[PDB]
Structure formats: structure tokens, C-alpha cells
């Protein structure tokens, strides 16, 4: 039968204690929610192959299971008889009925044991209880994990380790042993490679896990390294079409390359004139030469000989000659000696390889063979791959001897005397060097491997004359000239190729790839998700195609709403109502069409006082890191190796110090705008206004206000250190309280000079004057205004005592810095190609000369991590400085005064602003005037009275239908039109829209 | 197509056009009132008189020259059309930005054609020519340098993005102060 | 090659993070510039301005 | 190198040495006597004039 | 005038550093290119270079 593994079969992968850590592991595991096979076998035995590891859970009451068997074909015979553990490794004879007794009355596991390899016996020991087990083997280790718990049941259970007795055999096959005299239940799972995310608690025990290659939500959790994911879009992985098959396409030639004639030749030229045979336009078999044992050395640069049969070469040059015995290694790239510089010089970038075999048979003769000659003196070294053939004698001195042999005038060619009498260190060697040159041209020489038919419109692994690649092939329209072979892109990419066999041009395009993103609501809400396969047609994977890619798991909706989660290209997704995930086009807002007319105005008759919050970062944590503790932890020779990189570390320290100073400067310029610390009076007769929620209270030791306290509760050793800020939070609170006291008791006067007292309602009248509202409006509604203000303040408290996301601008900053630091620490766990990430291990394992190589490889990469961190911090600090300059400007203009700038100090007509300190930031409570219930009125730009035209001094001419009044612009306060609130200019025949009415005159 | 991709902007150009048309409609039909609260209708010439008042000119000056003013405005608009239908360099501030980004990307691709001291700039050629133990040396030499090109590109993009954010904050300030209101700030 | 890359650490995760931050910042910029208005106003059919 | 302290961590009997969120060897069990010792780096820090 | 002076100093500081890095081996045998080129032949010289 079958059943489901409700998150079962997870063990401790190693004997490491981790507490309160979310650690991601990757090894053999039982996938979550898998088909675990149920067995209720009665009373030869079932055979359940060891694929990679077995999970085994039984609610044992009898344990008629008697043994475990492992092997390739069937030889491991492990037996737990419920009292002791007996392991045998012998080439056992498997019986016709493989089983044993239930007590023991049988010996049918095997008839005998011969040529035994291992044996062991362990200690003797003895539906309510579930007993879970995991059996696997890794590179010789045979690991058993277990867990025995009273009660597949759902829930969770971690598996502790147990005996590991390594053997190391090839196991392809498994049996659990049965026995013959009821039945019980046992479930068999099957491990496989898998990545998990494990959640250790504070006791160090695993309490939960995520099988993160299961479903998109779990992939999201695993990329975020968290068990909870908030609403949003997360790019989790990269989708790409795998190639279906491989295409090999080589030219139709079969003439074998002439290798016998440059190897079996009776004659080889002398080294001073090495003979160069060319090889092109043939099929080369390099396996025959490498597999031949006739060659003393066969060593290759730029290629591996075993792969030579799978390459295509534009040209090959076989240069053959003979040399003296232990000069053989002078024929190599970047080697010095007599023949490597005077006779045959290889390039440094030599691709190809060298073949040498002793020939003391046909190149050696008694009496000495003097035909094998070599130049010994030359005026200069030889260039790579140049032959110098000459006989001019070597003018070792300044004497122009001009061909006569004497002192300081020597013959340059000297001959070996080759005999069979000579020893191994002299006897001649026959050498041939094969110089290929690789793909920059249509290949001529190719290996023996055969072609195959081509396919089109399908992603494949193509191989055109050694041109390897992966992509989809399409019939093209490009006009290749008959000599052209393959095209290229502006990006220097192999766009097109001509097939060698048939002369047609095929466009290559990379088969589709792209990111995959997970649209989720907050996991607090639900667990449904959609996935966006970016920029890919989803014929290549309800289902809905959009400009950003294909979105699956989300239904399309015609009704437009405001955005919740941005997909892109005008598309957002949201979790709506049964409940599901919808995707829709964004509604930019309520459609509106104000009823414009050329004699209609709309004037407010009331207002509201609105308090909004603007939260600004000001500073960030003053961190500082020193190299010679981070890079080279207390290792003096590592520091010596660091000294030769120069002054990188001094300047890194300087940069971080500059950042740290800049933070204190930012805080100073924001908060320390006031010179004296003002104090509010004990009395709070502020005209009915109520500042108790923002002014400090002495009830607490820290002299923060109520809202500051709410804000402070809403946001939360490798050479690193965190310097304390110069200004403590209490000093910041004092600055803010001083600013509040000055604003309340003195107005804007304390920002210009000495703080001049003024009753609050009077500066309020001033500020209403400042937005084009006459001050009477305040005094006739003062109580109302106060109440509104107080109510707004109350709402702020609520909106800050419920939702923590409002402070996100600050929180993100903190998170970002922490994120960087965590990365900076984890880069200390990286090898960077060295043998280890731990310096002391390198220093204890190796001696100095290779140890310093590994240490240099580590330093190069730890230094790079530091530079990356410091650059990111500098950029982020510039951003923070911009925000702090903005905050200082707002404090100067919104708090210390009244700004006419629109939407600078809140939405509306700015009346005033309050500062409140927040961790690494500042919060402005912007108090604004927002007009309210309005009415249409008929209006006219002017009024004709006696032929002369009358315009309003300040205000507009309105009418309720019968009578014409003049009113101030932002508040309906009609007044009788009089020769004092109007002024006259000219006659009433030029103004477009003037009307007829009387104008009173006292 | 070397792992690069260009994500589409969240707001399509039509949505941007709708936003701008909404701003124009509010400015024309309501004045600055729609930036402070509900959009309050007002005849255009009246908010024009308001704005002349805002620069220290009495509103009569407008009503006695309204036609002239309108004509001038219209003429100016016409000239703008001409100055935008002839010379393409006026948009250079935007064009440069585009060019810069493209430039960077082109560089980022061409660095895939560089050996960085290896035997080849193509990974599959290295993998087909050599066995694992020396192949990984060359591959490490390539990675060290492709990673460096990426870091260079990302650092440049971060700096350029900071510059663009500064410009966008300025643009938002101008929209708030110049469009949604009337700024007394000189040459702003 | 990816296995050889894994031993350089989390350079690539943070590079992707940085570019993603830039991309989000662009949409934020556009929002703060153009989406200052709350309602989509429409001009009347008549053009008596 | 570091200072060793008597710990309170609850190592499971198969566990040998602990580690930090920073992948640092926080604690070790002594091979001879089965007790758990916290390792902390002995104090360092800058000096300013 | 320090606000200006610092700027000047900073630039000069950077340049001085940029010059002193020409005196660093970076693990090579010498910080001078011509010495490397005069002491060694091409194939190992290019490694140091
Ligand atoms: C088969 C291999 C096998 C393993 C790996 C094993 C491990 C194992 N079983 C234990 C308890 C125990 N184990 C068993 C018996 C069993 N528990 C089982 O998983 C099975 C299959 C049986 C036999 C039918 C019992 C009865 C206890 C004690 C339970 C009790 O406290 O009453 C213990 C704790 C011993 C202690 O007190 O320190 C270990 C380590 N026992 C075994 O027999
Ligand atoms: C202006 O608006 C305020 C509220 O925004 C009005 O005050 C409210 O008046 C109603 C009477 O209908 C009371 O029930 C409320 O308690 C009042 N609220 C407050 C906060 O005082 C006020 O009446 C409006 N003025 C005009 C002229 O309409
Ligand atoms: C200012 O407002 C606060 C509310 O935030 C008032 O404090 C309340 O006062 C009443 C009695 O006056 C108490 O019953 C409440 O328990 C108080 N609430 C809190 C949170 O302290 C304060 O009284 C107001 N000031 C004035 C002068 O009226
Ligand atoms: C427009 O306003 C005028 C001015 O108040 C209104 O005239 C007054 O109307 C009330 C009641 O209708 C009378 O008690 C006053 O004596 C009137 N005053 C004058 C000077 O005539 C007029 O009714 C209003 N009309 C509309 C349509 O609202
Ligand atoms: C077992 O697996 C098959 C295919 O993998 C699946 O169709 C079936 O539903 C699974 N069994 C159970 C009980 O889920
Ligand atoms: C496990 O954690 C709990 C949490 O309160 C604690 O009380 C207990 O002592 C810890 N250890 C064990 C063995 O439960
Ligand atoms: C032989 O080469 C010719 C050249 O065009 C080609 O048409 C033909 O398919 C080739 N045949 C084989 C068996 O490769
Ligand atoms: C001739 O050369 C081939 C290939 O190099 C080799 O297999 C063969 O043994 C040679 N002939 C003799 C007689 O050795
Ligand atoms: C996706 O594939 C279909 C298949 O016919 C094609 O018509 C369409 O143009 C492709 N591209 C899209 C939908 O963007
Ligand atoms: C949405 O609009 C499309 C118009 O193309 C229409 O075909 C579809 O039926 C509509 N769906 C709903 C649910 O109204
Ligand atoms: C002004 O008049 C228009 C058209 O009659 C109407 O739609 C609008 O609601 C009126 N204003 C108010 C505040 O009612
Ligand atoms: C504009 O005003 C004129 C006179 O001032 C009037 O005749 C005309 O009807 C008004 N426009 C509209 C659309 O009513
Ligand atoms: C205003 O009154 C004058 C004379 O009193 C008259 O000529 C003119 O036509 C009137 N205009 C209107 C709109 O009533
Ligand atoms: C020998 O090992 C035991 C194991 O616990 C330990 O207690 C004892 O101290 C050790 N003695 C020596 C001399 O190492």
C-alpha cells in the first residue's frame, strides 16, 4: 500500500551544537509528503532496493523483522536479533528461502561462510511506541540514526545518531529479513539528495524544518532563511530549459592523418635543423600514439591527451628531431638550457605536446654516429619556433677572424658521438612535438568521432567542428559569403554557424532562461502562492501570460484596484475573495472630473487639522573594522604577507572612520540647531491644546515623551566593533524637548534670535495668517481646532501602537547594516580556493613556503570582501547624509518656522511641526490645515459700479444667487462689498466677465 | 542574453501619461487647491490673477491685458513645439543616462571575451581541452575577473542610481512646489 | 564552475541583492514623482480657459 | 586562542562542539572529562589618544 | 576655511596612496617592472608581471 510522510524522517546531520539558529543543510533526506510504503507482511522476504538510503518507521509490538542485507547482486549480512547487533562481511551463499527464525530454529540466511572479511558483535540489550530509523552509507561509513517515542502520526521528531561501523562495499540491493514460525505495521521510506532548512531552539534541538525543494513557498523560505515570509514578491530561483540531446556535426572526410611516416621514419633530422611536417585536412587518431607504450614520455601542455580524440584543430605541426638523453626536458615551454635557447625554443603559450622515446638502436652505432649535430654557440637566443641554419663560426671575442678557427673563434655546430656504448644519460632520444593551434578558424584536423543528424527548433548541445555550445538551431536568412563559416554578434557571440556537411546557415539562439519569482501574501495570512516565470512564453513550462512573463497560480480579474504586490508592466496581484490570489491592472485612483466653468468657484466653509508623520533616517551605526585582525587573526606571518600589499588597510580604516565621524556630524546638524535648552513652564495653559503626549514626563527615568517611548519599542568579535554615538538618546530627547518648548512658548522667534514668549493661540493666529486665513477664523473656532488637534494626536498614538510597519524606513536601514556585517563575517568561512578557511589549520598542516601561497590566496579575497563592504557602506552613508540634510532642512523650515513650500512639511497648508527622536532617526508630526466641506458659488473677476470697475483687495467676489459678497479665498466668510475691501482700476468695458452690481460706501 | 535581463517598469508609459494629464487637469481647473485637499474649481483667469498677486503684481494688470497674455502664452507654447521638433540635443540629459547604462552593459558583455590570463575566454573549450585538475585552475582564473567585472558594474550602477535618485527627488520637489503650487524660490 | 564559485562565498547573493534594490528604487522614484495626485482628474469637454 | 569558561549549554550526548550564528566555534566538549566549555575571544579593541 | 582645506587634503591623500602602491610587491619578487624584466626570462617574468 502507500501513505504520506507528514514531515517525518529528519535527523541531526552532524554532531555540532547549534542554538537558536536557522541552518541550511544539503544531504540525503526523506522528502516531505512523500509516498512512504506501508507493509503489513504476515508471518522469501520482501526485497526493497537500497537506492540511496532507507527510512524505516515501525510501531513495533513483535519485531518479526530479523535482519538487514546489503549488496551489489547477492555481501553485508547485518542482524539485529533484538538483543545484540551482529555484522558479517563474507561472500555468503544465499539460500532458496532467505529468512531466519522468529526462537531461532533455522539457518536459512546462509548455509556457510567462506573467505570472511569482517565480523562484529555489539553489546547485549533487550501500538504505543513508534521507532523511527534511518540507514544510509557515505563513502564507507554506514550510518544509523534513530528515535524511539511513545504515541504515521503527524507532528515532528528529530532523529539522534547511533552506531556507525564503516564497511565500504558496493550496495545496489537491500533486504529486510522475515521469519517463519501474526503481523504488524512497518513503513519504508527512501532518502534522496535534498536541501533542508532546520530550526534549532535554545536547547539546541531541532523543532521544525523546511523541505525547501518541495514547493515555491518553501523555496522562498529557504532563500530568505526564514520560516515566515511577509507579503511581497521574491525572486527565488532561475528557470532554464535543459538541452534535450547532443548534436555532433563534423566534416565528411575519412583520410587518416600521416602519423606513421613521422614516427616510423628511419631518419630523423638533427636538432639544429628540426624537420617540420604539416598535418591538415585529415582525420587524426591520437589514441594509437598515447596508448602505445613505445614512448618514454608523452606530456602535454594546453590539452589533456585523453581528450585529444574529441578536439578539432585548425592546423597541426609535427616537428621531429633527436637529442641527447637528459636534455629531453629542455624541450618544453619556458625552459632554459643549451638546446631550448640555441636550437629549439617553444613559446610560453605552447598548445600541444611532446613525445620522447629512447632510440639506442638505429641512431647509435659503434665507433660513434657523428651525423647528429647541434649548434652550441649563437650570437643571441632563439625566438619561439624559428629554425636557424648556418655554419658561420662564433666570434667569441672581438677578433674579426672571418672564418679561420683559432682562439675566440669557434665552430658553432658540435656533434654527438652516439654509440651503443654510451650510458642512459647520453644515449640518443627521438622526439616529436605536436603544435596545434585552436579555434580561430574553420577546423581542418578533427578527431575520429562520428557525426550525427541535426535537429532544429529544439534546445540541444551542438558541436560544429569542435565549436561546442548549447542552444536552439533555426533555419536562417543571413547571406553568408561563400568563404564565411560562422557569424558573430555585436556582443561577440556566435550567432550563426554554417553546417560543414550541408552548406546552409543556422541561427543559434540560447534556449529560454529567466528568473522565477514567487508572488505570496504574508504567510500569516495564507499559504497559497503564484509564480511568475519572467520574460518567457509559457508554452515552454490558472495560467495567464503578461508583459512581465507568465503568471501561474493567480486568476485574472477585469476589475481594477490599487496595487498590493507589484508584478510589473501595470500588473499587481493581491489576496482577495472563497479566497485566492488575483492579478489585475492597477487603478491609478478614483476617476474624477471637477465641474469647471468660467463663472463657478468652490469655496470651503469648514476645515480639518491633520497631523501626519514623516520618518527620516539621520544616522547609522558607527562600525569600525581593522584588517590585521579580520584578515590575519593574530598570525604574524600573515601580517607580514599583508604588508606587501601596501596601504589598502590604512585607507580602509580611514574610510570607515570618516563614515563614523559623519554620523555624529549628521546628528549634530539635525538636532543641535537650538543653542539653549528651553523648558516648558509647569502650567500647561496652551489655549486648550494638549501636548502631554509629546512633551517629556518626569514619571520615567528616561525623559522621553510618550510617543518617543512608543517609537523606541517599535524598531528593534572578528576585529569588528561598534562605536557608541557621541550623543546619547537622552541628549537627543533633551534637544527635541527644547525644540518643542521653543516652538510652543516662543513660536519661530527662537530660531532667529532670542526666544520671545507669545501665547500659543497668538502664534496660531500668526500661522493661520501665514496660509491666507484671517486670524478671526481661529478665535471664533479655537475650541474646535484644539479638539481636532488633540484627536489627531490621539490617532497618531493608535497608529503607532498597532502597526509597526510605519517605522520601516528606519528599520530597513538597521537591517541593511546588520545584513552587510553578517555577510562580512560569513566570508571568513570561505576557502577562496585555498585548502581551508582557517588560518591556523593551514599554518599547522603546511610548512612556510606552500603555507604562504594558501595564505596569500585567502588574503586575496578577505581583503576583497572588506573593500566590497566599505564601498557599500560609503554609498549607504552618502544616502544617509542626504536624508539627514533633508531632516535638518525640515527642522529648520517646518519646526523653527512655517514653510510655504508645498508638500514639504506635510499634505496641506503647513501650520507647524513637532520633532520626536527615534532610534537612528527623527519623526516629524506635521500639523496642517486641510479644507473641508465646500460649496459652489457664482463668481466674477470684477464688478462695475458707476462705469468704473472694482476688484477685490484680497478675496474673490461670490454670490449666493441674489447678493454679491467678497470673501477670503480659503474659507467662506462673505462680507458686504465696500469701497475698502475693493479697489478701483479703469472702466468696465475691458474686463472679460465683469458683472453689474452696487458697491456700498460709508 | 548572458544572464542579463531588463525588468519592465511597474508603471507603463500610459499610466505615467494619465498621471500627468490628471496633474494638468487639476492645475488648470482647480489651481493649487488640489495639492492641499479636495480640488476646488476656479475659473482659469482667476487663479491667474491669484498668481500675479503672488509675484507682487495687482490682478487688474491681468484683466486689462488678458487677451495679450493669452496670446503670448500660446505663442510661447508654439515655439516650444518648434524647439522640440528641430533640435534633438535638448533631451540630451535623458539620452546620456540611457547611453551610460547601455555603455556599461556592453562593457559587461565584452568582458566575457577576455582570457584574464587563462588559455581561453570560453569555458567549454577549457573543459573539453583539459582534465579537471588543471581545468579548475584556468576556470578559477576566469572567475576571478568575471566576478571583478560584475563588482565594477554593480558599483557603478549603485553610484549612478544615487545620482538618479537625487534627480528624482529634485523632480518630485519641483512637481510639489512648481506644479502643485507657486514657488517664491528664485530660479527654481 | 558553479562548484568552484561556491567557495568564494556569498558575493553573488549580495550582488543580486544590490541590483534588486536599485530596481525597486527606480519604481519608488517614479511613484514619488508622478503619483502625487490621489484622484485622476479629467478636463471638461469645453475648453473655455 | 581564547578564554575558557564553564558553560551552561545542554549538549546532547553525541554532540562534541557548538557553533555560533557567525559560524564560530563557540563551545567545546573536553575529550578527557565530559564537560562543556564556552570559548570567548580574550579582550581586544582599539586604543585612541 | 577647513571645509575647503579638507577637500584638497583628501584628494592629495588619495593621490599619495595611489603612488605608494607602486612600491608594493603584491607578492611578486619586486615592485619594479624593469628589474623583473632584467632578472627573469619571459615565461616566469610574465607570471610576476
Ligand atoms: C534493532 C536494532 C536496535 C537498535 C538500533 C537499538 C537502539 C536502542 N534501543 C534502546 C531502547 C530499547 N530498545 C528496545 C527494543 C527494540 N527497539 C527497536 O527499535 C527494535 C527494533 C527493538 C526490538 C524489537 C526496548 C524494549 C528498549 C527499552 C524500552 C523501555 O525503556 O522499556 C536504546 C537505549 C538503550 C539505553 O537504555 O541506553 C538504544 C540505544 N536497540 C535495538 O534492538
Ligand atoms: C466643521 O467640522 C467640525 C468637525 O469636523 C464640526 O464639528 C462637529 O459638529 C457636529 C455637529 O453636527 C458634532 O456632533 C461634532 O461633535 C463636532 N465635532 C467636533 C470635533 O467638535 C463643525 O460643526 C463643522 N462646522 C460647520 C460650520 O459645519
Ligand atoms: C491632555 O491629554 C491627556 C490624554 O492623553 C490627558 O490625560 C488624561 O487625563 C484624564 C483626566 O484629565 C485621565 O482620566 C486619563 O487617564 C489621562 N490619560 C492619560 C493617558 O494620562 C490630560 O489630562 C490632558 N490635559 C489636560 C490639561 O486636560
Ligand atoms: C443670499 O444672501 C442674502 C444676504 O443675507 C440673503 O438675504 C437675506 O435673507 C434672509 C432670509 O432669506 C433675510 O432674513 C435677510 O433680511 C436678507 N438680507 C437682505 C439684505 O436682503 C438671501 O436670502 C440669500 N439668498 C440665497 C438664495 O441664499
Ligand atoms: C504515489 O505517487 C504517485 C506518483 O508519484 C501519485 O500519483 C500518488 O498519489 C502517490 N500516492 C499517494 C497516496 O499520494
Ligand atoms: C529546554 O528548554 C526549556 C524551555 O523553558 C527549559 O525549561 C529546559 O530546561 C530545557 N532543557 C530540557 C532538557 O528540557
Ligand atoms: C559526405 O559528404 C557530403 C558532402 O556534402 C555530404 O553531402 C554527405 O551527407 C556526407 N555523407 C556522410 C555519410 O557523412
Ligand atoms: C608504425 O607506426 C604506427 C603508428 O605510429 C605504429 O602503430 C606501428 O607499430 C609502427 N610500425 C612498427 C613496425 O613499429
Ligand atoms: C508565445 O507562443 C505563441 C505560440 O504560437 C506565439 O503565437 C506568441 O507570439 C508567443 N509570444 C508571446 C505570447 O509573447
Ligand atoms: C474580462 O474581459 C474580457 C475582455 O477581453 C472578457 O473576455 C472576459 O469574459 C471578462 N471576464 C469577466 C470575469 O468579466
Ligand atoms: C457644483 O456643481 C456641479 C455641477 O452642478 C456638481 O456636480 C457639484 O457637486 C457641485 N459642488 C458641490 C460641492 O456640490
Ligand atoms: C463663459 O462666459 C461667457 C460670458 O462671461 C458666457 O457667455 C459663456 O456661456 C461662459 N461659458 C460657458 C461654457 O457657459
Ligand atoms: C450693466 O449696466 C450698464 C449700464 O448700467 C449696461 O450698459 C450694461 O449692458 C449692463 N450689463 C449687464 C451684463 O447687465
Ligand atoms: C584517562 O581517560 C579517562 C577517561 O575519562 C580520564 O578520566 C583520565 O583522566 C585519563 N587519564 C590520563 C592520565 O590521561
UniProtKB/Swiss-Prot annotation, chain A:
Stated consequence of mutating residue 373 to R: In strain: Delta/B.1.617.2, Epsilon/B.1.427/B.1.429, Kappa/B.1.617.1, Lambda/C.37, 19B/501Y, Omicron/BA.4, Omicron/BA.5, Omicron/BQ.1.1; Contributes to cellular immunity evasion and increases infectivity
Primary localization: virion
Protein's membrane topology: Single-pass type I membrane protein
Sugar-modified residues: 35, 81, 115, 170, 203, 244, 246, 252, 264, 524, 537, 558, 577, 598, 606, 690, 936, 960, 996
Effect noted on mutating residue 361 to K: In strain: Omicron/BA.1, Omicron/BA.2, Omicron/BA.2.12.1, Omicron/BA.2.75, Omicron/BA.4, Omicron/BA.5, Omicron/BQ.1.1, Omicron/XBB.1.5, Omicron/EG.5.1
Statement on biotechnological application from the UniProt entry: Main component of the anti-COVID vaccine Chadox1/AZD1222/AstraZeneca; in which the human tPA leader sequence is added in N-terminus to enhance protein secretion.
Annotated effect of mutating residue 97 to Y: In strain: Gamma/P.1
Cysteines paired by S-S bonds: 90-116, 212-222, 257-282, 300-353, 312-446, 401-409, 459-511, 538-550, 563-572, 627-649, 632-638, 894-905, 944-988
Extracellular compartment residues: 1-1002
Result for mutant: residue 104 to K: In strain: Kappa/B.1.617.1
Pfam families listed in its UniProt record: bCoV_S1_N (PF16451), bCoV_S1_RBD (PF09408), CoV_S1_C (PF19209), CoV_S2 (PF01601)
Consequence of substituting residue 963 to Y: In strain: Theta/P.3
Effect ascribed to mutating residue 535 to G: Increase of pseudotyped VSV particle production ex vivo. Increase of viral load in hamster upper respiratory tract
Outcome when changing residue 491 to D: In strain: Alpha/B.1.1.7
Stretches the record annotates as Immunodominant HLA epitope recognized by the CD8+: 369-377
Region (Disordered): 101-114, 240-256, 376-411, 440-462
Effect listed in the UniProt record for changing residue 131 to S: In strain: Gamma/P.1
Region annotation (Receptor-binding motif) ranges: 358-429
Region annotation (Putative superantigen) ranges: 201-222
Effect of residue 399 to K: In strain: Delta/B.1.617.2, Omicron/BA.1, Omicron/BA.2, Omicron/BA.2.12.1, Omicron/BA.2.75, Omicron/BA.4, Omicron/BA.5, Omicron/BQ.1.1, Omicron/XBB.1.5, Omicron/EG.5.1
Outcome after substituting residue 326 to N: In strain: Omicron/BA.2, Omicron/BA.2.12.1, Omicron/BA.2.75, Omicron/BA.4, Omicron/BA.5, Omicron/BQ.1.1, Omicron/XBB.1.5, Omicron/EG.5.1; complete loss of interaction with host integrins
Region: Receptor-binding domain (RBD), residue numbers: 240-462
Other remarks on this protein: Variant D614G has become the most prevalent circulating sequence in the global pandemic since April 2020. The mutation is associated with higher viral loads produced in cell culture and animal models. It would not change pathogenicity nor neutralization properties vs vaccination. May be prevalent because the mutation increases virus transmission in human population.
HAMAP family for the chain: BETA_CORONA_SPIKE
UniProt similarity note: Belongs to the betacoronaviruses spike protein family.
Protein name (database record): Spike glycoprotein
Organism: Severe acute respiratory syndrome coronavirus 2 (2019-nCoV)
Lineage: Viruses, Riboviria, Orthornavirae, Pisuviricota, Pisoniviricetes
Gene: S
Amino acid at each position: 500500500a502507500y501513505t504520506n510522510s507528514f514531515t517525518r524522517g529528519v535527523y541531526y546531520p552532524d554532531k555540532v551544537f547549534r542554538s537558536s539558529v536557522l541552518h541550511s543543510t544539503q544531504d540525503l533526506f526523506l522528502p516531505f509528503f512523500s509516498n512512504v510504503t506501508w507493509f503489513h507482511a504476515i508471518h522469501d522476504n520482501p526485497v526493497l532496493p537500497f537506492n540511496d538510503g532507507v527510512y524505516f518507521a515501525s510501531t513495533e509490538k513483535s519485531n518479526i523483522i530479523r535482519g538487514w542485507i546489503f549488496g551489489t547482486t547477492l555481501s553485508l549480512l547485518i542482524v539485529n536479533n533484538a538483543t545484540n547487533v551482529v555484522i558479517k562481511v563474507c561472500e555468503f551463499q544465499f539460500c532458496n528461502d532467505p529468512f531466519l527464525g522468529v526462537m531461532e530454529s533455522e539457518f536459512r540466511v546462509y548455509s556457510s561462510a567462506n573467505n570472511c572479511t569482517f565480523e562484529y558483535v555489539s553489546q547485549p540489550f533487550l501500538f504505543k511506541n513508534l521507532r523511527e530509523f534511518v540507514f544510509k552509507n557515505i563513502d564507507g561509513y554506514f550510518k544509523i540514526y534513530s528515535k524511539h517515542t511513545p504515541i504515521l502520526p503527524q507532528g515532528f521528531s528529530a532523529l539522534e545518531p547511533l552506531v556507525d561501523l564503516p564497511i565500504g562495499i558496493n550496495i545496489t540491493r537491500f533486504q529486510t529479513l522475515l521469519a517463519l514460525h501474526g503481523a504488524a505495521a512497518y513503513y519504508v521510506g527512501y532518502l534522496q539528495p535534498r536541501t533542508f532548512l532546520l530550526k534549532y531552539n535554545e536547547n539546541g534541538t531541532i523543532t521544525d524544518a523546511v523541505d525547501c525543494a518541495l514547493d515555491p513557498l518553501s523555496e522562498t523560505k529557504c532563500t530568505l532563511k526564514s520560516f515566515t515570509v511577509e507579503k511581497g514578491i521574491y525572486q527565488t530561483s532561475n528557470f532554464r530549459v535543459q538541452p534535450t540531446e547532443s548534436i555532433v556535426r563534423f566534416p565528411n572526410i575519412t583520410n587518416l592523418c600521416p602519423f606513421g611516416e613521422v614516427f616510423n621514419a628511419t631518419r630523423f633530422a638533427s636538432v639544429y635543423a628540426w624537420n617540420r611536417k604539416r598535418i591538415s585536412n585529415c582525420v587524426a587518431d591520437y589514441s594509437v600514439l598515447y596508448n602505445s607504450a613505445s614512448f618514454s614520455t608523452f606530456k602535454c601542455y594546453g590539452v589533456s591527451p585523453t581528450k585529444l580524440n574529441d578536439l578539432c584543430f585548425t592546423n597541426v605541426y609535427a616537428d621531429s628531431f633527436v637529442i641527447r638523453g637528459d636534455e629531453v626536458r629542455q624541450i618544453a615551454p619556458g625552459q632554459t638550457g643549451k638546446i631550448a635557447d640555441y636550437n629549439y625554443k617553444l613559446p610560453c603559450d605552447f598548445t600541444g605536446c611532446v613525445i620522447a622515446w629512447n632510440s639506442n638502436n638505429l641512431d647509435s652505432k659503434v665507433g660513434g654516429n657523428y651525423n647528429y649535430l647541434y649548434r652550441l654557440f649563437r650570437k643571441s637566443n632563439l625566438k619561439p619556433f624559428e629554425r636557424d641554419i648556418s655554419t658561420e663560426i662564433y666570434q667569441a671575442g672581438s677578433t674579426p677572424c672571418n672564418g679561420v678557427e683559432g682562439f675566440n673563434c669557434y665552430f658553432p655546430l658540435q656533434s654527438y658521438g652516439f654509440q651503443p656504448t654510451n650510458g642512459v644519460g647520453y644515449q640518443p632520444y627521438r622526439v616529436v612535438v605536436l603544435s596545434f593551434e585552436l579555434l580561430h578558424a574553420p577546423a581542418t584536423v578533427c578527431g575520429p568521432k562520428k557525426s550525427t543528424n541535426l535537429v532544429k527548433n529544439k534546445c540541444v548541445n551542438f558541436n560544429f567542428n569542435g565549436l561546442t555550445g548549447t542552444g536552439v538551431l533555426t533555419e536562417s536568412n543571413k547571406k553568408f559569403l561563400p568563404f564565411q563559416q560562422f557569424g558573430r554578434d555585436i556582443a561577440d557571440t556566435t550567432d550563426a554557424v554554417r553546417d560543414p556537411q550541408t552548406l546552409e546557415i543556422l541561427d543559434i539562439t540560447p534556449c529560454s532562461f529567466g528568473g522565477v519569482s514567487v508572488i505570496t501574501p504574508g504567510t500569516n495570512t495564507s499559504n497559497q502562492v503564484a509564480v511568475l516565470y519572467q520574460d518567457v512564453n509559457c508554452t515552454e513550462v490558472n495560467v495567464f501570460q503578461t508583459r512581465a512573463g507568465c503568471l501561474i497560480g493567480a486568476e485574472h480579474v477585469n476589475n481594477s484596484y490599487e496595487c498590493d504586490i507589484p508584478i510589473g508592466a501595470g500588473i499587481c496581484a493581491s489576496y482577495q475573495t472563497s479566497q485566492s490570489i488575483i492579478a489585475y491592472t492597477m487603478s491609478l485612483g478614483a476617476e474624477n472630473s471637477v465641474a469647471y466653468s468660467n463663472n463657478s468657484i468652490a469655496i470651503p466653509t469648514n476645515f480639518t487639522i491633520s497631523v501626519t508623520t514623516e520618518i527620516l533616517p539621520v544616522s547609522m551605526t558607527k562600525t569600525s573594522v581593522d584588517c590585521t585582525m579580520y584578515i590575519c587573526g593574530d598570525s604574524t606571518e600573515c601580517s607580514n604577507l599583508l604588508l606587501q600589499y601596501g596601504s589598502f588597510c590604512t585607507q580602509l580604516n580611514r574610510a570607515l572612520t570618516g563614515i563614523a565621524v559623519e554620523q555624529d556630524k549628521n546628528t549634530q546638524e539635525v538636532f543641535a540647531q537650538v543653542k539653549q535648552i528651553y523648558k516648558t513652564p509647569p502650567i500647561k495653559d496652551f489655549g486648550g491644546f494638549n501636548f502631554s503626549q509629546i512633551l517629556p514626563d518626569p514619571s520615567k527615568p528616561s525623559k522621553r515623551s510618550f510617543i518617543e517611548d512608543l517609537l523606541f519599542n517599535k524598531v528593534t568579535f572578528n576585529g569588528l566593533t561598534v562605536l557608541p554615538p557621541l550623543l546619547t538618546d537622552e541628549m537627543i530627547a533633551q534637544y527635541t524637548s527644547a525644540l518643542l518648548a521653543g516652538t510652543i512658548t516662543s513660536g519661530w522667534t527662537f530660531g532667529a534670535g532670542a526666544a520671545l514668549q507669545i501665547p500659543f493661540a497668538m502664534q496660531m493666529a500668526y500661522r493661520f495668517n501665514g496660509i491666507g486665513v484671517t486670524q478671526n477664523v481661529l478665535y471664533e473656532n479655537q475650541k474646535l481646532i484644539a479638539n481636532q488637534f488633540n484627536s489627531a494626536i490621539g490617532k497618531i498614538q493608535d497608529s503607532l501602537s498597532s502597526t509597526a510597519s510605519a517605522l520601516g524606513k528606519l528599520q530597513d536601514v538597521v537591517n541593511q547594516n546588520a545584513q552587510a556585517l553578517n555577510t562580512l563575517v560569513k566570508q571568513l568561512s570561505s576557502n577562496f580556493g585555498a585548502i581551508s578557511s582557517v588560518l591556523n589549520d593551514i599554518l599547522s598542516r603546511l610548512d612556510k613556503c606552500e603555507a604562504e601561497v594558501q595564505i596569500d590566496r585567502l588574503i586575496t579575497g578577505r581583503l576583497q570582501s572588506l573593500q566590497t563592504y566599505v564601498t557599500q557602506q560609503l554609498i549607504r552613508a552618502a544616502e544617509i547624509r542626504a536624508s539627514a540634510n533633508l531632516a535638518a532642512t525640515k527642522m529648520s523650515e517646518c519646526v523653527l518656522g512655517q514653510s510655504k513650500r508645498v508638500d514639504f512639511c506635510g499634505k496641506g497648508y503647513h501650520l507647524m511641526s513637532f520633532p520626536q527622536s527615534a532610534p537612528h532617526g527623527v519623526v516629524f508630526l506635521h500639523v496642517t490645515y486641510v479644507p473641508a466641506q465646500e460649496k459652489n458659488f457664482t463668481t466674477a473677476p470684477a464688478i462695475c459700479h458707476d462705469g468704473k470697475a472694482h476688484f477685490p483687495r484680497e478675496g474673490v467676489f461670490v454670490s449666493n444667487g441674489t447678493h454679491w459678497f467678497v470673501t477670503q479665498r480659503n474659507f467662506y466668510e462673505p462680507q458686504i462689498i465696500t469701497t475698502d475691501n475693493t479697489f478701483v482700476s479703469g472702466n468696465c468695458d475691458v474686463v472679460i466677465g465683469i458683472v453689474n452690481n452696487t458697491v456700498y460706501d460709508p
